[PDB]
Amino acid sequence: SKEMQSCVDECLRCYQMCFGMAMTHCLETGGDHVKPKHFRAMISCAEMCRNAAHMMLMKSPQARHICEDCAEACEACAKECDALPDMKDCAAQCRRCAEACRKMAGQK
Amino acid sequence: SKEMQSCVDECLRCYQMCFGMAMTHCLETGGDHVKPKHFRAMISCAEMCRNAAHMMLMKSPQARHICEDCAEACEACAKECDALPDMKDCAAQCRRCAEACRKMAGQK
Amino acid sequence: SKEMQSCVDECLRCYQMCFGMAMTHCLETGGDHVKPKHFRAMISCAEMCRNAAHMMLMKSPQARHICEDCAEACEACAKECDALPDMKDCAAQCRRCAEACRKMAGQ
Amino acid sequence: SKEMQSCVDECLRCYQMCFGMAMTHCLETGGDHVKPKHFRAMISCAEMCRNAAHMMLMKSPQARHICEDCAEACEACAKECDALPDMKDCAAQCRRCAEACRKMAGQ
Ligand SMILES: [Cu+]
Ligand SMILES: [Cu+]
Ligand SMILES: [Cu+]
Ligand SMILES: [Cu+]
Ligand SMILES: [Cu+]
Ligand SMILES: [Cu+]
Ligand SMILES: [Cu+]
Ligand SMILES: [Cu+]
Ligand SMILES: [Cu+]
Ligand SMILES: [Cu+]
Ligand SMILES: [Cu+]
Ligand SMILES: [Cu+]
Ligand SMILES: [Cu+]
Ligand SMILES: [Cu+]
Ligand SMILES: [Cu+]
Ligand SMILES: [Cu+]
Ligand SMILES: [Cu+]
Ligand SMILES: [Cu+]
Ligand SMILES: [Cu+]
Ligand SMILES: [Cu+]
Ligand SMILES: [Cu+]
Ligand SMILES: [Cu+]
Ligand SMILES: [Cu+]
Ligand SMILES: [Cu+]
Ligand SMILES: [Cu+]
Ligand SMILES: [Cu+]
Ligand SMILES: [Cu+]
Ligand SMILES: [Cu+]
Ligand SMILES: [Cu+]
Ligand SMILES: [Cu+]
Ligand SMILES: [Cu+]
Ligand SMILES: [Cu+]
Ligand SMILES: [Cu+]
Ligand SMILES: [Cu+]
Ligand SMILES: [Cu+]
Ligand SMILES: [Cu+]
Ligand SMILES: [Cu+]
Ligand SMILES: [Cu+]
Ligand SMILES: [Cu+]
Ligand SMILES: [Cu+]
Ligand SMILES: [Cu+]
Ligand SMILES: [Cu+]
Ligand SMILES: [Cu+]
Ligand SMILES: [Cu+]
Ligand SMILES: [Cu+]
Ligand SMILES: [Cu+]
Ligand SMILES: [Cu+]
Ligand SMILES: [Cu+]
Ligand SMILES: [Cu+]
Ligand SMILES: [Cu+]
Ligand SMILES: [Cu+]
Ligand SMILES: [Cu+]
Ligand SMILES: [Cu+]
Ligand SMILES: [Cu+]
Ligand SMILES: [Cu+]
Ligand SMILES: [Cu+]
Ligand SMILES: [Cu+]
Ligand SMILES: [Cu+]
Ligand SMILES: [Cu+]
Ligand SMILES: [Cu+]
Ligand SMILES: [Cu+]
Ligand SMILES: [Cu+]
Ligand SMILES: [Cu+]
Ligand SMILES: [Cu+]
Ligand SMILES: [Cu+]
Ligand SMILES: [Cu+]
Ligand SMILES: [Cu+]
Ligand SMILES: [Cu+]
Ligand SMILES: [Zn+2]
Ligand SMILES: [Zn+2]
């Protein structure tokens, strides 16, 4: 319930990063920033992180498993953000969240 | 509670239309389909319709007001979808939902 | 994307059932209807089903896995709804969704 | 901008407070904490705050109006949390968010 508020805070920060970037910077730049695979990864990751926050906040039985999946979502989205100019901060945030997701998924 | 299940069904259908089209057809086509104003309208409308469904399902005090706003979101999004090839079904759905939103917002 | 529109429709129906029942019938009845384990199962299942719908609608890479988990959520919530006579429709809906979740997760 | 990231941060904090309290402390205590009007206000307010954050993050045209409504949700939920033991922090947070909502709705 300390590593927990940590994972919640991290997943909400990452939700903000990925959803906020997609719908502002990426949408406004166009080009590679809105190519299906990259953009879908961003929206997918943002929803996973927001859904993970929710499941943790209600102390769901499946919170630990959901965060395990959120770690994969975060990792996949980091890879898709590495190639792009301006997306290196997002990719770092996603890798940071992925670590947090993995830590709390392995505690009880 | 009949006009109610109607508004819920309509807003969920419209959520599916706008969010599903944005993230599949629009994202895959590119061009006009991902221009910021049009795309933002689609994502905005989808979330409004999904949020309206939620507030109705929990019999929120603000459900009637939220649907009033959802009607405007739906109308605005219909206008943004009129110009675009393959978006005519979406635009019709948005106008249909806007009507449903307006009916239930004016009853008890 | 036929078994897919099926899973979407089912998960949205089940979201409606579990969230709508929790916040209306269960909240209004009280008693066993708002006991933590039962109620948390309901809210948890509702969010899983709505999250699953979303991930499927955007053709997320992880949609198959998420639905696998949604099947377990639905099954667990069905068990928690069995003991109350007024929750029999909810429990059936959850078992129906769990089947749909399992079909599409294996495609 | 600045007052914007402020409203987002505040609405997400308030979402955390109201949803996390409802589903933990309130659900676990029962009694007044799960009476329909109070509990519905908490869930409603949490969703309003989370929905407002979303609409702001995507720079929706309707973000200003939505936050206006979130301010009312926050105020109403604060009133419903004032009476209850252990809900004093929640009520303060709701009043704080309501102010933030009102600032950005007017800028
Ligand atoms: Cu997390
Ligand atoms: Cu977590
Ligand atoms: Cu995350
Ligand atoms: Cu992120
Ligand atoms: Cu970008
Ligand atoms: Cu991007
Ligand atoms: Cu994420
Ligand atoms: Cu992400
Ligand atoms: Cu996460
Ligand atoms: Cu994640
Ligand atoms: Cu990414
Ligand atoms: Cu990402
Ligand atoms: Cu990222
Ligand atoms: Cu990213
Ligand atoms: Cu992330
Ligand atoms: Cu994470
Ligand atoms: Cu996580
Ligand atoms: Cu509606
Ligand atoms: Cu409505
Ligand atoms: Cu709608
Ligand atoms: Cu729509
Ligand atoms: Cu389109
Ligand atoms: Cu579009
Ligand atoms: Cu729409
Ligand atoms: Cu809409
Ligand atoms: Cu609507
Ligand atoms: Cu609408
Ligand atoms: Cu639309
Ligand atoms: Cu539209
Ligand atoms: Cu539409
Ligand atoms: Cu549209
Ligand atoms: Cu709509
Ligand atoms: Cu509507
Ligand atoms: Cu509506
Ligand atoms: Cu499903
Ligand atoms: Cu389901
Ligand atoms: Cu359900
Ligand atoms: Cu019940
Ligand atoms: Cu119940
Ligand atoms: Cu469910
Ligand atoms: Cu369920
Ligand atoms: Cu499901
Ligand atoms: Cu599915
Ligand atoms: Cu499920
Ligand atoms: Cu279900
Ligand atoms: Cu259940
Ligand atoms: Cu259920
Ligand atoms: Cu059920
Ligand atoms: Cu149930
Ligand atoms: Cu299902
Ligand atoms: Cu599913
Ligand atoms: Cu705010
Ligand atoms: Cu705001
Ligand atoms: Cu708020
Ligand atoms: Cu709150
Ligand atoms: Cu409480
Ligand atoms: Cu409470
Ligand atoms: Cu609140
Ligand atoms: Cu709130
Ligand atoms: Cu708010
Ligand atoms: Cu608020
Ligand atoms: Cu509140
Ligand atoms: Cu409150
Ligand atoms: Cu509060
Ligand atoms: Cu509260
Ligand atoms: Cu609030
Ligand atoms: Cu606020
Ligand atoms: Cu606000
Ligand atoms: Zn999983
Ligand atoms: Zn309004």
- Write down how many β-strands of chain A occur, each being a DSSP E stretch of 2 or more residues: 0
Q: Decide which structural class fits the backbone of chain A.
A: mainly alpha
Biggest interface, residues from each chain = A-C, 20 and 20 residues
Beta-strand content bin of chain A: under 5%
Question: What would you report as the Rg of chain A, rounded to the nearest angstrom?
Answer: 13 Å
Portion of residues in helices of chain A? over 70%
Shape of chain A: elongated
Bound molecules: copper (I) ion, zinc ion
* Number of separate structural domains of chain A: 1
Count, helices of chain A: 4
> For this entry, what is the oligomeric state of its chains?
homotetramer
PDB class: metal binding protein
Keywords: Copper, copper storage, four-helix bundle, metal binding protein
Assembly: tetrameric
Entry title: The structure of a cytosolic copper storage protein from Methylocystis sp. Strain Rockwell (ATCC 49242)
SSE topology sketch:
4 copies of one chain form a homotetramer.
Chain A: H1 3-29, H2 36-57, H3 63-82, H4 88-105
Helix pairs in contact in A: 1-2, 1-4, 2-3, 3-4
Bound molecules: copper (I) ion (68 copies) and zinc ion (ZN) (2 copies).
Residues 41-42, 45, 77-78, 80-81, 90-91, 94 of chain A line the site of one copper (I) ion.
Can you describe this structure?
The structure is a homotetramer. Chain A has one domain (1-108). Chain A has four helices and no strands. Chain A has helices at residues 3-29, 36-57, 63-82, 88-105. In chain A, α1 packs antiparallel against α2 (36-57) and α1 (3-29) runs antiparallel to α4. Chains in contact: A-B, A-C, A-D, B-C, B-D, C-D. The interface between A and C is medium-sized, with 20 and 20 residues. The complex binds copper (I) ion (68 copies) and zinc ion (2 copies). Residues 11, 48-49, 52, 67, 70, 74, 97, 101 of chain A line the site of one copper (I) ion.
